[PDB]
């Protein structure tokens with residue numbers, strides 16, 4: 001499942017991770033939208049090449065071969081690459097990666113400019129788009145701008161990570177209008193309000209139907225379901241949860257019926273890093289003897305966030321502290337639910353309190369749907385935060 005990237009229709013490019021690449025849909029996608037590698041006539045660049053990392057390697061269809069410049073950016077020199085197409089070609093996107101060898105990410109175009117020419121020769125280039133990407137240097141990114149005709153496309157490494165501009169691949173794509181519609185599903189990057197054109201179930205369901213023959217329809221489903229969850233959301237109704245020591249976690253048969261499978265955990269994270277090697281993944285390793293401990297400390301609240309693969313209805317969260325001393329036992333807890341896979345869509349489900357104790361405690365509340373859960377350490381014994389296990393039980 002992709003998530004909407006936000007609309008782009010200024011002259012600042014939208015740059016996002018090209019997650020499409022990992023999918024079984026890629027080939028069908030490329031068939032329809034990619035500019036064939038066979039339409040790329042030639043490539044040159046102004047900085048030469050390092051060793052055998054020749055410029056042809058930037059457009060050979062292999063993410064495991066790269067060009068690297070022979071001359072790094074400096075205060076006086078900016079690396080650029082010029083691609084010539086067989087014929088004038090309409091393009092709205094570049095998909096780009098830096099080198100992916102042992103120095104992966106080195107030379108990533110952290111800032112770039114894109115220029116068009118309709119000629120084969122001459123310096124008549126006009127600025128099409130400028131952009132940046134600050135998230136990572138290791139990513140395959142989609143750079144999306146206004147659809148433009150190119151005989152030659154010039155790509156300038158305005159800032160290259162560690163100056164030594166590199167490219168595993170430059171790939172080119174034609175406009176995908178339905179994809180852009182999907183990119184405009186939400187009003188902003190928080191993805192917690194559906195855009196006006198989809199802002200009813202009637203409109204959203206019609207849109208889903210409209211996407212059904214699209215090559216990456218299956219990847220759109222997650223975002224569509226997120227929108228639907230927002231459209232159908234009810235007012236938050238937090239209660240006080242009842243907290244008590246429990247031992248039913250020992251009961252395998254019970255767990256089979258009532259405990260959410262650990263395999264349903266897509267991801268875990270927290271806001272406070274961790275102390276020593278008491279990392280977060282051991283709050284969910286199914287071992288009461290291993291525990292997470294925060295790197296930060298209350299004042300600030302510690303919070304843990306668990307993402308699920310499948311939405312699940314829970315009525316209980318079971319937790320315990322580090323068993324040695326009980327340091328960082330959540331004495332007071334806020335439980336937040338989101339019904340979306342991403343976005344700023346959490347609502348408060350329940351508040352609860354219990355004295356620190358050995359063993360496991362359930363926090364029981366009203367049955368609630370969770371696609372993701374936030375566990376907030378309101379008050380914690382000794383202003384630390386610790387989890388030996390975090391478990392989720394159904395009504």
Ligand SMILES: CC(=O)N[C@@H]1[C@@H](O)[C@@H](O)[C@@H](CO)O[C@@H]1O
Nearest residue numbers: 050053068101102103104106164
């Ligand atoms: C493997 C590795 O890091 N190779 C790089 C090489 O590609 C080039 O950037 C060079 C510049 O002095 O620095 C390193 O040797």
Ligand SMILES: [Ca+2]
Nearest residue numbers: 057062065168
């Ligand atoms: Ca390559």
Ligand SMILES: [Ca+2]
Nearest residue numbers: 282287290388
């Ligand atoms: Ca554990």
